[PDB]
Amino acid sequence: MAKADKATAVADIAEQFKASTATVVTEYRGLTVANLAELRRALGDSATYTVAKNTLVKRAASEAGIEGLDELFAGPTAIAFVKGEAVDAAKAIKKFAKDNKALVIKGGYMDGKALSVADVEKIADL
């Protein structure tokens, strides 16, 4: 661990958030590498799913276009990013969610808004 790598991860989060469009943040619980890798290779040939921090993501947020959130990452963080649109992969994480139920789908930053019953759930499932 190094603060140089902290700034590196902040820059990586900022630039990949700018490059890829959909960003589904998740609270990971009830996992296992053997199964998450297996499902991820299948559902993620156009996305990628991995960790985020509570403060490095906040720095990348202040330095990217997701500026004011600052309180969502109080908990485990296993963000995935879809470089097209999280519809197939969003449905994928939705079925994984209704399978395990330990994982929570925190939300995202599709465009301006963070999370609500209106857009994120329905664009994910349907």
């Binding site: 053997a34 890798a37 290779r41």
Partner: protein, 133 residues
Amino acid sequence: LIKLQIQAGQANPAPPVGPALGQHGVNIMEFCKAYNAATESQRGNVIPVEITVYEDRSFTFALKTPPAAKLLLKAAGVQKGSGEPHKTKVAKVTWDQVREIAETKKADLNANDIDAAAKIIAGTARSMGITVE
């Protein structure tokens, strides 16, 4: 999850198979026939059949791809896996065989694709003792 590269037609020795799954609590005679019935169409397999179970003690299993090490052996002619790579390259394994491994393991391996699977089995053989190129 009793992970064992269970062998060909054999009378169930003690170390690898029988009590190996017995200590976890799976039956002793049904699994060999139930797996032979699936390897009829795939005659020739020493698959790492990770023996699995149901709620009330039933034989659940999804047949897996054969092992990369032992498939490399069966394809390299002499069924003998060495132990000293990087210093003595026993025999150069060929790309079509590496890709046949990749194709038969793309079903039931955690590889991304053909070339990722090839790199995975490359590391496998790199630890093993045999060339992969």
